[PDB]
Swiss-Prot record, chains B, C:
The active site is at residues 30, 52, 104. Phosphorylated on serine and threonine residues. The very N-terminus plays a role in the particle assembly process. The N-terminus also contains a nuclear localization signal and a supraphysiological nuclear export signal (supraNES), which is an unusually strong NES that mediates host CRM1 binding in the absence of RanGTP and thus can bind CRM1, not only in the nucleus, but also in the cytoplasm. The C-terminus functions as a protease during translation to cleave itself from the translating structural polyprotein. Residues 46-51, 138-142 are annotated as: Interaction with spike glycoprotein E2. It comes from Western equine encephalitis virus. The record marks 78, 111 as: Involved in dimerization of the capsid protein. It is found in: Virion; Host cytoplasm; Host cell membrane; Host nucleus. This is Capsid protein.
Length: 48, 153, 153
């Protein structure tokens, strides 16, 4: 084998897209949860 | 007040009061103890920790005979188990000396028999004592008004 | 009430009341029986099942002499065959031990002899009895008021 096998450029863009979508789902979920908590707190403070 | 307000037991001593309004039973969270009423002991309480309170759905046989609610709060004198409380400048105050530990959860009643606020604590200014309580609004918002230096009773 | 309220029979037993209001006849669905009056027996009863009711268009002669509904509901006391019914916080109640099965469809009367609600059932709650009924509204709307534990009379 004339070229070494790395980790970055060793997985297809289909697998990369699926993995990134699955992980970004959780990332998006946690950030939307955080902004939901923040906006609820701000609404409570404003309408208090 | 006397009929509907129940003492709470902490090792056999009074330490607070649980108040029923509009078919829901409220109790301050900071006061720890057991409700004297055997039935209310079985009522599940869900807690608002930030408001220092727990509220629960009351049974079917006693929700009607409840302290009727209200929201209009003109300044002046209002009823109280220990006497009269002065509501002025959007603040509830009492003469300095009356009230203390064990009076948390005491309802403040109206002239017509309705509830205006529930007591949680008090801070002594030397001249009077400003009560840290929960006061309602026209838009149905319950603001926990606590003057500076408030200590829960 | 007596002149223009017609019982419904079943095997010689009265089980419900039909009411003529606004020029139209109403009869609740949970009760089964025969309308006493012969002339109204020929009306086709259009059913609102989710409203637990049937309504029908009355003939010409008697449409002039019917009960009148109302929209404004000042809280307090309202007339009824079994006395005064108490209205507050958007809820109807009666003193306990008053009313029972077979009283469905009996209208709630007021000072100026106009209907404010139609009785459908009641839940006994010890101190009082909360009436599960149907009421009108300011914007020309019919709304059910059925408290928890309501059982149809």
């Amino acid at each position: 084998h004339k070229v070494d096998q790395e980790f970055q450029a060793a997985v297809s863009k289909t697998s990369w897209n699926w993995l990134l979508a699955l992980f970004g789902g959780a990332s998006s979920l946690i950030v939307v949860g955080l902004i939901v908590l923040v906006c609820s707190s701000m609404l409570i403070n404003t309408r208090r | 007040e006397s009929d509907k307000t129940f003492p709470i037991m902490l090792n056999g001593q009074v330490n607070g009061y649980a108040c029923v309004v509009g078919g829901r039973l409220m109790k301050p969270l900071h006061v720890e103890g057991k409700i004297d009423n055997e039935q209310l002991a079985a009522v599940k309480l869900k807690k608002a920790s930030m408001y220092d309170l727990e509220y629960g759905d009351v049974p079917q046989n006693m929700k009607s005979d409840t302290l009727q609610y209200t929201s209009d709060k003109p300044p002046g004198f209002y009823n109280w188990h220990h006497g009269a409380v002065q509501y002025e400048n959007g603040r509830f105050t009492v003469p300095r000396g009356v009230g203390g530990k064990g009076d948390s959860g005491r309802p403040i009643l109206d002239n017509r028999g309705r509830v205006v606020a529930i007591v949680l604590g008090g801070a002594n200014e030397g001249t009077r004592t400003a009560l840290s309580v929960v006061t309602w609004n026209q838009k149905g918002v319950t603001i926990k008004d606590t003057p500076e230096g408030s200590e829960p009773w």
